[PDB]
Design a protein around this nucleic acid. Structure first.
Lengths: 62, 99, 52, 174, 50, 126
RNA sequence: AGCGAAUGAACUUUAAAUAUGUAAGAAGCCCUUGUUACUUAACUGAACGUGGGCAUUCGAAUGUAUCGACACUAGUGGGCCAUUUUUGGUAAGCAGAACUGGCGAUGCGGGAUGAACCGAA
């Protein structure tokens, strides 16, 4: 949340299924991965989130 | 804030409908992440990536004449003692008088 | 049927902005400055200030 | 013009890769608010040097207040005013408690006495005569003179303008 | 609620962060130039004749 | 110079040759060549009449025409984002392709050291 | 601005303001390969076919009370004044172009009054 702003999104029904689509949309708007009609490119931001995780921009362990 | 709360109106299918509820923001600007009326305040003030869509959704503000009037010589420059032109932070005194 | 000013009635204000209750409750419009003794203006700034 | 203030305006040419760290000019400007103080800064600067608003920037604007607005000072203003013939120099003197009160009385004087407008008057230098016997005008020297004391003959009473009629005739000795 | 709680925070920090930098540069021996304004409200106050 | 039927040209109208010169309204304009002759050329030039526009077919000599390089920007720009789009897709890093219209200046500081400001009078005397 | 850069409006590293022509993708680009009735020493050019990428930033901003093609149907085809630019002339008036604006089909507030002024439909 602190790395990529991440304002409080709606978890909707269940958990995780819709939160990932919400967290990608906010990342697309903040980083700049919008569309032609202003829509958030979910594939671009999730790739950009995947680009950050492989590069080490996100921290975690097991 | 007082321009949107008091004289804020939208463009829903070409019609001027006032922002009386948060719901009509989401049905027209919720595809850009703007779902509340504080979101529209934040997008207009701190100019964000969806300013193109927020400003055109906003109907032009039909303001009143200023309370107390203009300066005596209205159609001169603000630097020359009048009202026309750029006044920077002094637009707020004009907003408070008109709105 | 009737346009309602959020600045006049606070029920429509609480309808639009739920944070308006905690804004008044915690007095966010009366936040004070952070503590700390303010250091004096530099003397170099003063002689610049009244040069001519 | 109204409640005039005195501003310190710092400006410079826009920095360039060929000319980094430019000359950083400064002027003292008597203006009613900030937006004309910035406008009068770029008006004079484009007259002297090549720098203009599009190719320059404003570094700082700071108001300057009087050291002691409660003491009475004699001020000498050198000014250059444009008439229908040409440019002329004057040295005028006024007795105030502040520098903005000096130029406020100056603009009223030049408008009343020489029909001069704001865009024709160039305030060259405003100085405070720190010691007396440097006052050189006869009207101000008249006020500086020793144990000064005058009466107030023919003081009209302040009768309210909506009191149309009065019973007793007014007196002019107070 | 949480988003407007977050929004009103930055309105306070941005005012304080612009204030503190003008204070610091003054003390360090420099001048701070604020960013030119990115938002302008335009009011038409004269009729379209000639 | 070689001029093809159907290219963009600029009309300058040099004063050295009095033959085949057009009016001063077609001096310093830009049009399209539609007919080429032995010594003159035919240029279609848009002209403004009140509210509408009219296309006028006038004859200009070779000595007064000159090719325009308005195609030079469009051909350069079309290639330029194409190689970057090939590069950005190869790298898998998103890249801005449009051109942004000159944002306002940001905030910074200016040190007064070695740059003490000089006070100027309203008029220069020295 | 400089000529502590060169050279000398006709000087230029740079560069105004200000109006004013032309372009700003998918109906688009490039080149490869073939033909032609055109052209050239020659796919050197033009045309017809071939290939590619990007359709979830398709290549500046702002606005968009839809746009285009075809067919059919009425009324119109006068000018007067002013600003700016500009050509000529007089002792001074003045005459002619180009743009824009107003009035012409327009009510209201003001300038005591008013075709040409100011505000505002």
């Amino acid at each position: 949340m602190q790395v990529y702003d991440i304002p409080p999104l709606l978890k909707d029904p269940s958990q995780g299924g819709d939160a990932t689509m919400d967290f990608l949309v906010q990342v697309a708007r903040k980083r700049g991965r919008l569309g032609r009609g202003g829509v958030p490119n979910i594939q671009a931001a999730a790739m950009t989130v995947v680009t950050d995780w492989r590069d080490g921009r996100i921290q975690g362990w097991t | 804030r007082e321009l949107i709360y008091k004289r804020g109106y939208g463009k829903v299918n070409g019609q001027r409908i006032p922002l009386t509820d948060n719901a009509i923001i989401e049905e027209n600007l919720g595809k850009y992440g703007i779902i509340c009326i504080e979101d529209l305040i934040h997008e207009i003030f701190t100019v964000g990536p969806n300013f193109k869509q927020a400003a055109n959704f906003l109907w032009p503000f039909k303001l009143s004449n200023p309370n107390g009037g203009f300066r005596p010589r209205k159609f001169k420059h603000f630097i020359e003692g009048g009202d026309l032109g750029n006044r920077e932070e002094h637009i707020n005194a004009l907003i408070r008088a008109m709105n | 049927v009737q346009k309602k000013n959020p600045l006049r009635n606070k029920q429509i204000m609480l309808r639009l902005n739920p944070y308006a209750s905690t804004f008044a409750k915690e007095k966010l419009g009366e936040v004070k400055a952070e503590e700390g003794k303010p250091p004096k203006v530099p003397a170099s700034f003063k002689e610049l200030l009244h040069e001519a | 013009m109204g409640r005039l203030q005195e501003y310190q305006v710092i400006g410079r040419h826009l920095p360039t890769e060929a000319n980094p760290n430019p000359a950083l000019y400064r002027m003292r400007i008597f203006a009613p608010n900030e937006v004309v103080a910035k406008s009068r800064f770029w008006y004079f600067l484009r007259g002297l040097k090549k720098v203009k608003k599009a190719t320059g920037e404003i570094v700082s604007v700071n108001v300057i207040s009087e050291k002691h607005p409660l003491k009475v000072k004699n001020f000498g203003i050198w000014l250059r005013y444009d008439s229908r013939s040409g440019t002329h120099n004057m040295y005028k003197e006024y007795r105030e408690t502040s520098r903005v009160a000096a130029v406020e009385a100056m603009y009223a004087d030049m408008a009343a006495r020489h029909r001069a407008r704001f865009r024709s008057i160039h305030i060259l230098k405003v100085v405070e005569l720190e010691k007396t016997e440097d006052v050189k005008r006869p009207y101000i020297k008249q006020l500086v003179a020793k144990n000064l004391s005058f009466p107030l003959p023919h003081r009209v009473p302040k009768i309210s303008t909506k009191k149309i009629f009065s019973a007793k005739r007014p007196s002019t000795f107070s | 609620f949480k988003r407007a709680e977050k929004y009103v925070k930055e309105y306070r920090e941005q005012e304080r962060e612009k204030i503190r930098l003008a204070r610091i540069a003054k003390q360090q021996g420099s001048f701070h130039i604020p960013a030119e304004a990115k938002l302008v409200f335009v009011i038409r106050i004269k009729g379209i004749n000639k | 110079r070689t001029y093809r039927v159907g290219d963009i040209v600029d009309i300058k109208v040099n004063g050295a040759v009095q033959k085949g010169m057009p009016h001063k309204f077609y001096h310093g304009k830009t049009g399209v060549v539609y007919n080429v002759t032995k010594s003159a050329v035919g240029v279609i030039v848009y002209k403004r009449v009140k509210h509408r526009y009219i296309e006028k077919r006038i004859n200009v000599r070779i000595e007064h025409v000159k090719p325009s390089r308005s195609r030079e920007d469009f051909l350069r720009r079309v290639k330029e984002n194409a190689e970057l789009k090939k590069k950005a897709k190869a790298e898998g890093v998103p890249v801005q392709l449009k051109r942004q219209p000159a944002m306002p200046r940001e905030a910074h500081t200016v040190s007064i050291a070695d740059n003490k400001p000089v006070t100027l009078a309203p008029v220069a005397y020295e």
